[PDB]
Design an enzyme around this catalytic site. Structure first.
Site, PDB file in Angstrom:
ATOM      1  CG  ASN A  90      -1.857   7.152  -0.968  1.00 39.67           C
ATOM      2  OD1 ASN A  90      -2.883   6.593  -0.532  1.00 39.67           O
ATOM      3  ND2 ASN A  90      -0.927   7.672  -0.171  1.00 39.67           N
ATOM      4  CG  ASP A 189      -1.287   3.947  -0.574  1.00 42.61           C
ATOM      5  OD1 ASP A 189      -0.797   4.117  -1.678  1.00 42.61           O
ATOM      6  OD2 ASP A 189      -0.680   4.230   0.544  1.00 42.61           O
ATOM      7  CG  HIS A 345      -0.720  -4.010   0.518  1.00 38.52           C
ATOM      8  ND1 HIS A 345      -1.935  -4.092  -0.193  1.00 38.52           N
ATOM      9  CD2 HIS A 345      -0.675  -2.810   1.202  1.00 38.52           C
ATOM     10  CE1 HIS A 345      -2.596  -2.961   0.098  1.00 38.52           C
ATOM     11  NE2 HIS A 345      -1.864  -2.143   0.911  1.00 38.52           N
ATOM     12  CG  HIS A 379      -6.370  -1.844   3.338  1.00 41.11           C
ATOM     13  ND1 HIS A 379      -6.257  -1.715   4.722  1.00 41.11           N
ATOM     14  CD2 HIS A 379      -5.422  -1.037   2.795  1.00 41.11           C
ATOM     15  CE1 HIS A 379      -5.293  -0.805   4.985  1.00 41.11           C
ATOM     16  NE2 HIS A 379      -4.773  -0.386   3.845  1.00 41.11           N
ATOM     17  CD  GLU A 404      -8.439   2.378   0.905  1.00 44.25           C
ATOM     18  OE1 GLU A 404      -7.812   1.450   1.392  1.00 44.25           O
ATOM     19  OE2 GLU A 404      -7.909   3.590   0.884  1.00 44.25           O
ATOM     20  CG  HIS A 406      -8.498   7.158   1.141  1.00 43.11           C
ATOM     21  ND1 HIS A 406      -7.251   6.669   1.617  1.00 43.11           N
ATOM     22  CD2 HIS A 406      -8.737   8.362   1.734  1.00 43.11           C
ATOM     23  CE1 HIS A 406      -6.762   7.607   2.438  1.00 43.11           C
ATOM     24  NE2 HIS A 406      -7.647   8.641   2.533  1.00 43.11           N
ATOM     25  CD  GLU A 449      -6.923   5.163   4.321  1.00 42.22           C
ATOM     26  OE1 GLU A 449      -6.457   4.547   3.397  1.00 42.22           O
ATOM     27  OE2 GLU A 449      -6.204   5.962   5.082  1.00 42.22           O
ATOM     28  CD  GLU A 525      -3.364   1.816   7.900  1.00 44.94           C
ATOM     29  OE1 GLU A 525      -2.767   2.732   7.382  1.00 44.94           O
ATOM     30  OE2 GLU A 525      -4.335   1.223   7.245  1.00 44.94           O
ATOM     31  CE1 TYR A 526       3.557   0.828  16.743  1.00 47.88           C
ATOM     32  CE2 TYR A 526       2.101  -0.749  15.589  1.00 47.88           C
ATOM     33  CZ  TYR A 526       3.165  -0.486  16.454  1.00 47.88           C
ATOM     34  OH  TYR A 526       3.863  -1.574  16.939  1.00 47.88           O
ATOM     35  CB  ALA A 527       5.499   2.525  13.669  1.00 47.68           C
ATOM     36  CG  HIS A 528       3.865   5.546   7.089  1.00 51.09           C
ATOM     37  ND1 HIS A 528       4.638   6.214   6.133  1.00 51.09           N
ATOM     38  CD2 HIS A 528       2.836   4.894   6.452  1.00 51.09           C
ATOM     39  CE1 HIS A 528       4.089   5.922   4.930  1.00 51.09           C
ATOM     40  NE2 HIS A 528       3.006   5.141   5.101  1.00 51.09           N
ATOM     41  CG  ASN A 585       3.345   9.044 -10.259  1.00 52.46           C
ATOM     42  OD1 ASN A 585       4.032   9.358  -9.274  1.00 52.46           O
ATOM     43  ND2 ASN A 585       3.525   9.617 -11.441  1.00 52.46           N
ATOM     44  CG  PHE A 589       3.756   8.569  -0.372  1.00 52.76           C
ATOM     45  CD1 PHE A 589       4.182   9.721  -1.046  1.00 52.76           C
ATOM     46  CD2 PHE A 589       3.738   8.550   1.033  1.00 52.76           C
ATOM     47  CE1 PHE A 589       4.529  10.870  -0.324  1.00 52.76           C
ATOM     48  CE2 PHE A 589       4.114   9.674   1.780  1.00 52.76           C
ATOM     49  CZ  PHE A 589       4.537  10.809   1.079  1.00 52.76           C
ATOM     50  CG  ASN A 592       4.349   3.000   2.639  1.00 54.77           C
ATOM     51  OD1 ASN A 592       3.154   2.842   2.318  1.00 54.77           O
ATOM     52  ND2 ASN A 592       4.974   4.051   2.127  1.00 54.77           N
ATOM     53  CD1 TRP A 987      -0.063  12.620   6.757  1.00 53.22           C
ATOM     54  CD2 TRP A 987       0.900  10.671   6.062  1.00 53.22           C
ATOM     55  NE1 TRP A 987      -0.640  11.573   7.470  1.00 53.22           N
ATOM     56  CE2 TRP A 987      -0.089  10.372   7.054  1.00 53.22           C
ATOM     57  CE3 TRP A 987       1.657   9.629   5.454  1.00 53.22           C
ATOM     58  CZ2 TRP A 987      -0.324   9.059   7.445  1.00 53.22           C
ATOM     59  CZ3 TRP A 987       1.357   8.354   5.800  1.00 53.22           C
ATOM     60  CH2 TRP A 987       0.382   8.073   6.781  1.00 53.22           C
TER      61      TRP A 987
HETATM   62 MG   LIG Z   1      -6.264   4.654   1.337  1.00 52.06          MG
HETATM   63 NA    NA Z   2       1.620   3.858   0.922  1.00 51.41          NA
HETATM   64 NA    NA Z   3       2.024  13.113  -8.367  1.00 50.61          NA
END
Ligand SMILES: [Mg+2]
Ligand code: NA
Ligand code: NA
Ligand SMILES: [Mg+2]
Ligand SMILES: [Mg+2]
Ligand SMILES: [Mg+2]
Ligand SMILES: [Mg+2]
Ligand SMILES: [Mg+2]
Ligand SMILES: [Mg+2]
Ligand SMILES: [Mg+2]
Ligand code: NA
Ligand code: NA
Ligand code: NA
Ligand code: NA
Ligand code: NA
Ligand code: NA
Ligand code: NA
Ligand code: NA
Lengths: 1011, 1011
Positions: A90, A189, A345, A379, A404, A406, A449, A525-528, A585, A589, A592, A987
């Site tokens: 991620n 991610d 994505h 992204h 990105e 991040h 990010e 981004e909202y409501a994961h 890894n 995650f 989603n 998270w």
């Molecule tokens: Mg990221």
């Molecule tokens: Na993700």
């Molecule tokens: Na891990």
């Protein structure tokens, strides 16, 4: 040279970027967007060999095919063919952080293709090759001679091959590096793959040619007049006899046309652009473009001579729309948008990151069908066809640069460093140059990010300067920096602030009004939607509708990035992070989405569809008021169907045409409703149905619904009293009750109903016991892991309190006989290490009617973490085909995710009562249930339940759905109360206080009887 | 690779840019700015060989010295050693415009140096080499191995040589390309040279080192408190024991000191910079920095361990000052500036573009002495010492990125193209990284004459984002674009509009008030001082003082870019464009300075000094009111000297100490003015003298002056009856007059005084004749050329009208005798192609006193272009040592450039009466003259005159001063009227209407008599 370890070299010999070209040599083809003989696809079978580093590649490969190579299809990601593993990480970079260097073992894919070129392409003009997507960097050679190099895995790299080809067979050789300094800017991610994963093509253009063209549309105050402005550039030799003609068509009708020789207006002391011309065409009453009605015109740009010979033509679809922010609001054609968005994505469970037209169309149709009107390219710039489908089907798009970083510490370490400005600049400029004529793009984003660095500010301004037609947004550095025209947080909550240092996420309502703030707010981004989630979705929508400046958001995200693997038996299974030997890894995650990787919906999609409806309703009396949320269209493909039913029993229904202007209301009066036969609750359900098919939906599609309770006549009629009374038999070990064909056994040492019989058939495989835990959802677990426990996660709090390990202690178990029934009273304490967590007091009353009424009163210590649920459970001996209930449905629904569900009588095969989330957890609950029927059993009351062949213990012990195995019989979980599932993020704890079971004392009652 | 034809590669292996470092290993040496043993100069004798193209360089050169090479001094420009010719082209690129390519014939200079390196530099730490200036691109090898490549001829390029050196002898090889893609960004109007022209050094840094530091100073509202904030970054391994101490010193007093371990505050979700730290020091009552009082403190930054061991120290001079724009005014320390600026190129007539400290100090001193307080680095970052000198002597500086693409068509072709964004970005970011700690830099500039492109907008915001302490300006694209905080036009006039399309130059007074405009206006270039120029300079200063938002400007320019050449006998002479065989070239347009190349002033410098005075005066009766234009200092080094003279004869004088606060006034009462005993005009002159020497001037320096006429007593005294009466002798061809030992002869066919004798000595070589033309000034010529006439230039209008060819036609010549005199009357018409251009009517009255009174009445046809002058001329037979006159002086002055001259009695050697402008023209006039004496002659009247050994004819026929030769006798030009010289620009007519001779009829009168 190691150009792949130098951010100062992102390309060598690459041609300028530009909008989609086809070099038609027939204008009518250009008008209709027909295939062009001058734009050929090189997709199909290529030769490929994998090496562990570029140093291992043999020189022979430049001139001759490697005998060991294999033949494979292109485009593809080489991980999808098995040559090496894809990696799911991620935030942490998949390579050591040591910019701009990359590992010395750097997987290298050597692709080559022998292909023909006709002499006609070589006798005149220019032949270029275009690689729409190569991840992450590559060198190209043609007929053994080096041509050039390119980076940025998500935009096309084009090279002039004119001087390198010969008539007949030619051979290309492309050396693709998995890692490069461009990888430092590609830390999104998602799975980390590589290869020639987008189309490859060859384009022939004449020497004198259209090299760029930009289309703008500007309007008068009411949008009743527009001027279409087309700036056209050429390369090649200027001659007075050249001309450009730009014509605009609406369907088969030509709306306007203008011709001019080249030679632009004076720009400065040195003159103007002798190689450009701007044509301006007036358009009266233009049909405007929106996601509601994607009206399109076609602009055809012809380069030709004055005597009338065509040299070539290019063209594009044009949507007349204005996008602007005024007085704090984002306006489209002068009206404020309400973004019903989703991040998406490019991911296919078998093909990796290669996209195909079928999958694209399927995604857009599901999106529109579910009331989405907008998509964020998270992204990076997408495959070119995506934009064409969004223009034609109608979706607003956020086009985002492939930047990105991040995993850097701090996150803006590269973006605030001027040495990285060049590389970032090309990721932003090349995107605008390529996509600026698409009407569906309404906002540009600077990436994701990557903190907030001065390179962002520079880039934000560059865009503002070159294309003032669309707002620029960017969330890094706190979501409201000087590099964003829109406050665009990710995961900010509705009412709850998260005051992190430096980059707090304020409640969205509060954010809008901080001192001095005036911009619109649209969450990027909202409501994961990870696993069983979308809890609290309705709270965002109520806020978006009440606050003008809260203009919506993009849900995270559309589809799970699960990949298919094959078992020993050849059967496919959905895999996630770590399943390819990849490490480190980030495990599940990567999943989603609102939909599974094959596009099957998860239950949350219905919640999104309902909350994002375009019609709002109120009821007063028997008068339904319908308000339209459309900004531009009348409801010209809609009728309202209404139905009233008594406890699920249909009483009446009708239909009424909807005729509502955008933003208007319609009042519909229902007919007199005759009085119902008996006691119960009357319920009104209305649905908006589109009678005619559209480009995106079938005739009959239901686009919106709502329900209300009508009159209720509570039941006051006393029950026909028993023609028999049950008999109790007491033994040291048990209390048994017999009534005709039935028998109930209560174990005296455990205090539970341990067995029931109908005739001579036992009904239970495990006794009926209290249950206060659930197999933890992704949201209950968060980032917690065995090796790095997150003590703040709900799962950890429950575990630490002993919730999963608590043993029941019997406090009391007695039996009494009444005049018409037998009464068993129990009391149990659940304790852990000496602490009493919960106390359950019950009575079971079995009467002459054969009904067993269970009353439950639970006490929960105030200082223990609020429990996941308060209910009972048992494993029934029977496996039946159907589940029938009167309650909310038909799909899975939880307390904080039940608005889309409707109260009615539903009947589904048992398997539909289980939701196959890839990472298994508690699932399949249905709430607000008053009657449930299964096999010979019926339970009545006011509860939530789930029923399936998997126990909670199994679900919590199993990491992948493919490993689950049906248990004997059927596991029934019947809850008086169930905690919310949350999902504002996955998270940190996200279940709002109103859905936590914090009351201390709870009461519920169930009646169990035969059917 | 041809990296020099790829704007995508501006360097390879080059280290990051940073402020000046010295790696002291002793803090006190850092404090005192003493020479550091870790910073060595490699300047001195190098080996060099010239090649016609890089392909011609032998591979042997990498490993060893070419025998054919020569030994030369570095820094140098190879053209100054005679290897190839320097080229002077103004706008047109010196190479074909075909970006990014350069000619194949590309002069390449191969330099090499064999030098020693101490093992102590290699056994630990990092040894880097620094090239402060290489024009225009270069490759570097060390000991035969390739190191790296660099572009941008005006900023230092540094490379780490640690791994390439060995203890003992080493050899560097540098191949310098004259032309590269960088040249497209270096089209400034100056000589085009090449080479290693600024310092080369070796710097040793420890492995754990200070890699950058930024110093900021913020203040409270009245500047009584300041916060010094120093952000420090390190490279090397971080360790908890590391520390940074920043201490601030004011002379020997330690003002403040703070220490901290590394670890900055949280910046975003990923944390903060573990490798940086910010120290904040409070300073009470800071001594503020300005050009008026350049107070400086010293900041020392020590990197050390916790036990106190020093690792290294860096340092800088700090000036506490705030620059901000508020309410439309540029403020410094809260007060609005008035910029008395000048643009200054780095030019030496012998060394080309190599700068030395002595020349810089010479320039700085003359600037300050001449009332300049600011300088613009036209048009590139300067040699590093320049900023040190400005910080310490006190000058406000505009630091400008090395980006000029004037020669493109249109001008922004490259600056609007994103593919040139990277290259441009480095020219801006690297300048900022280098010079941001210098207090003298108050404004950043994005370059010059590159149109306005989106790349400018991007870079303008980058700056504003990284350094909010200084405004950003840029003139391209119309001077008031979105890329500039200041309206900063070049050559916009004071009252007259020049409405060019797209980039009009409005009158400055009008520009300020255009609809919606609010910014301050400071001309980036004005008053083009080419040749005999600066006409109308006072008009700019009157407007800057009357309009608050008009805050001054930078005159164009400081010093003529002439180069020395040597004739046959080895004597030097000043050369300009084309003089080295360079073609195309722009001839004398490279000479536009207030001073000649050798720093001798042109006469215009005194006009600049006077208009830029810091004290303004008014007179009211006996009262002189002095007002101070200083913003910060009191007049603590000044006294007012006054003097009253009657026609040059001193009557009284005195001195009064000046004690005026900044912006204050002081009234000074002059004593009773005793009446004068004789007719004449009394004149009052005042001067401001600085009694004490300063760092920039000597004791006695005069910094300001002003004059006023006081009472005048006209002469009413009848002369006196002549001792004798002149006699008239008439003959067919002449009218002769005799008086005593003098004789005058008037030729009857020409109508002019053809001869005059004192005794038997003839006094004329050419007759006394009217003259209506002048040898054209550079401003009269403009860009007109014999090969491409600009018909609008004044010289062409005069030529076309026949002014230079018109011949006198006699209309009348009569003689009459009066009671005590003889009277000659004449009339002549000047014609061309049958049109009468001018008519001159005169009378010569010769009386018993021997005086000849000449009355001249001239008519000038209305439709002929206004003439350059209306006067008489003659070639006198004698030559005399001195010239003495009662009029304005002492230096050359013209109608539109005579404010600085004072009315008095002056006496100079004849040669001071000629101004040696490199390109000769009319020169040396003095106006407002009432009496002129030369040899035994005296002329009285109210006229303008010039006197020298060169005729106007020779000056107009000769292109270089070195070729002029003294004619026999002395040429005297006495004008009743003379046209202004103009200079707002030197490429279009610029003489203001009020200075054109357009009245149609003119009268003047003179008396010539013997003395
Ligand atoms: Mg990221
Ligand atoms: Na993700
Ligand atoms: Na891990
Ligand atoms: Mg690279
Ligand atoms: Mg065809
Ligand atoms: Mg062949
Ligand atoms: Mg509802
Ligand atoms: Mg280059
Ligand atoms: Mg220029
Ligand atoms: Mg004066
Ligand atoms: Na809203
Ligand atoms: Na309808
Ligand atoms: Na599980
Ligand atoms: Na002013
Ligand atoms: Na020329
Ligand atoms: Na010049
Ligand atoms: Na004084
Ligand atoms: Na001349």
């Amino acid at each position: 040279r190691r150009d792949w370890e130098n951010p100062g070299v992102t390309q060598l010999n690459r041609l300028a970027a530009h909008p989609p070209f086809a070099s038609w040599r027939n204008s009518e083809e250009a008008r209709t967007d027909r295939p062009s003989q001058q734009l050929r696809s090189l997709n199909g079978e290529w030769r490929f060999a994998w090496f562990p580093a570029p140093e291992a590649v043999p020189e022979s490969w430049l001139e001759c095919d490697l005998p060991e190579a294999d033949t494979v299809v292109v485009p593809s990601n080489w991980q999808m063919h098995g040559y090496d593993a894809p990696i799911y990480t991620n935030v942490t970079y998949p390579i050591t952080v040591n910019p701009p260097f990359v590992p010395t073992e750097n997987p290298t894919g050597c692709y080559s293709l022998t292909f023909n070129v006709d002499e006609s392409w070589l006798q005149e003009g220019q032949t270029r090759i275009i690689f729409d997507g190569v991840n992450s960097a590559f060198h190209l050679w043609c007929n053994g001679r080096w041509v050039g190099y390119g980076q940025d895995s998500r935009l096309p790299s084009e090279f002039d091959l004119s001087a390198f080809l010969r008539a007949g067979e030619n051979r290309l050789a492309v050396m693709v590096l998995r890692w490069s300094d461009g990888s430092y800017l590609e830390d999104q991610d998602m799975w980390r793959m590589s290869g020639i994963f987008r189309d490859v093509s060859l384009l022939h253009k004449p020497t004198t040619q259209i090299s760029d063209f930009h289309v703008a549309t500007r309007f008068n105050d009411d949008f009743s007049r527009a001027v279409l402005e087309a700036e056209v550039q050429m390369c090649g030799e200027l001659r007075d006899y050249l001309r450009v003609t730009v014509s605009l068509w609406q369907g088969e009708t030509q709306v306007a046309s203008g011709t001019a020789p080249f030679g632009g207006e004076i720009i400065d002391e040195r003159g103007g652009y002798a190689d450009r011309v701007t044509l301006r065409l007036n358009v009266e009453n233009p049909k405007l473009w929106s996601a509601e009605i994607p009206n399109l015109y076609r602009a055809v740009v012809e380069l030709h001579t004055a005597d009338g010979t065509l040299i070539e033509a290019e063209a594009c679809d044009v949507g007349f729309r204005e996008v602007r922010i005024e007085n704090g609001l984002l306006l489209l054609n002068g009206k404020p948008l309400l973004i019903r968005g989703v991040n998406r994505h490019e991911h296919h469970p078998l093909h990796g990151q290669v996209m195909d037209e079928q999958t694209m169309v399927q995604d857009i149709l599901l999106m529109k069908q579910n009331n989405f009107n907008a998509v964020r390219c998270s992204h990076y710039p997408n495959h070119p066809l995506w934009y064409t489908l969004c223009d034609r089907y109608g979706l607003y798009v956020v086009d985002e640069a492939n930047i990105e970083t991040h995993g850097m510490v701090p996150m803006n370490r590269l973006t605030d460093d001027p040495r990285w400005l060049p590389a970032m600049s090309e990721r932003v400029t090349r995107m605008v140059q390529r996509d600026r004529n698409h009407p569906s793009v309404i906002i540009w984003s600077l990436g994701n990010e990557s903190g907030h660095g001065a390179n962002h500010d520079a880039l934000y301004r560059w865009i503002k300067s070159v294309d003032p037609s669309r707002p620029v947004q960017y969330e890094g550095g706190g979501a409201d920096t000087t590099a964003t025209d829109i406050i665009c947080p990710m995961y900010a909550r509705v009412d709850e602030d998260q005051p992190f240092p430096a980059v707090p996420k304020w409640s969205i309502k509060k954010w809008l009004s901080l001192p001095g703030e005036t911009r619109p707010l649209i969450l990027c981004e909202y409501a994961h939607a990870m696993g069983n989630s979308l809890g609290g979705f309705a709270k965002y929508w109520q806020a978006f509708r009440q606050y003008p400046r809260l203009q919506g958001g993009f849900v995270w995200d559309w589809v799970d990035q699960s990949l298919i693997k094959y078992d020993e038996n050849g059967n496919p299974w959905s895999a996630y992070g770590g399943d390819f030997g990849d490490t480190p890894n980030d495990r599940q995650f990567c999943m989603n989405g609102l939909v599974f990787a094959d596009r099957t919906p998860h239950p949350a999609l219905t919640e999104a569809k309902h909350q994002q409806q375009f019609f709002q309703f109120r009821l007063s009396g028997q008068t339904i008021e319908v308000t339209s949320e459309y900004l531009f269209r009348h409801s010209d493909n809609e009728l309202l169907h209404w139905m009233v039913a008594l406890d699920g029993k249909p009483l009446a229904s009708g239909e009424v045409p909807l005729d509502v202007a955008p933003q208007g209301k319609q009042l519909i009066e229902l007919p007199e409703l005759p009085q119902p036969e008996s006691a119960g609750q009357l319920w009104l359900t209305v649905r908006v149905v589109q009678p005619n098919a559209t480009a995106w939906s079938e005739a009959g599609h239901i686009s919106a619904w709502q329900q209300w309770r009508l009159a209720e006549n509570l039941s006051v009629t006393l029950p026909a009293a028993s023609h028999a009374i049950p008999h109790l038999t007491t033994s040291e070990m048990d209390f048994c009750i017999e009534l005709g064909n039935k028998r109930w056994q209560f174990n005296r040492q455990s205090g539970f109903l341990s067995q029931m019989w109908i005739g001579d058939k036992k009904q239970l495989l495990t006794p009926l016991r209290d249950q206060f835990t659930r197999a933890p959802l992704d949201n209950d677990i968060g980032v917690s892991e065995a090796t790095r426990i997150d003590p703040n996660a709900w799962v950890e709090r429950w575990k630490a309190a002993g919730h999963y390990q608590a043993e029941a202690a019997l406090l009391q178990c007695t039996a009494d006989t009444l005049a018409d029934a037998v009464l068993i009273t129990t009391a149990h304490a659940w304790q852990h290490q000496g602490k009493t967590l919960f106390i359950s007091r019950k009575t079971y009353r079995i009467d002459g009617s054969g009904q067993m009424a269970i009353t439950v009163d639970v006490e929960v210590a105030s200082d223990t973490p609020h429990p996941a649920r308060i209910g009972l459970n048992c494993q029934l001996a029977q496996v039946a085909e159907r589940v029938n209930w009167l309650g909310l449905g038909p799909q899975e629904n939880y307390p904080d995710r039940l608005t889309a569900a409707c109260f009615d009588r539903w009947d589904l095969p048992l398997s539909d009562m289980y939701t196959p989330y890839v990472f298994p957890s508690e699932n399949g609950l249905r709430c607000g249930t008053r009657e449930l029927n299964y096999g010979p059993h019926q339970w009545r009351g006011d509860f939530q339940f789930n029923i399936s062949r998997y126990s909670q213990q199994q679900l919590m012990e199993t990491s992948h759905r493919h490993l689950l195995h049906a248990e004997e019989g059927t596991w029934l979980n019947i809850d008086g109360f169930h905690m919310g599932i949350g999902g504002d993020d996955s998270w940190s704890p996200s279940v709002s206080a109103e859905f936590q079971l914090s009351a201390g004392r709870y009461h519920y009652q169930l009646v169990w009887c035969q059917k």
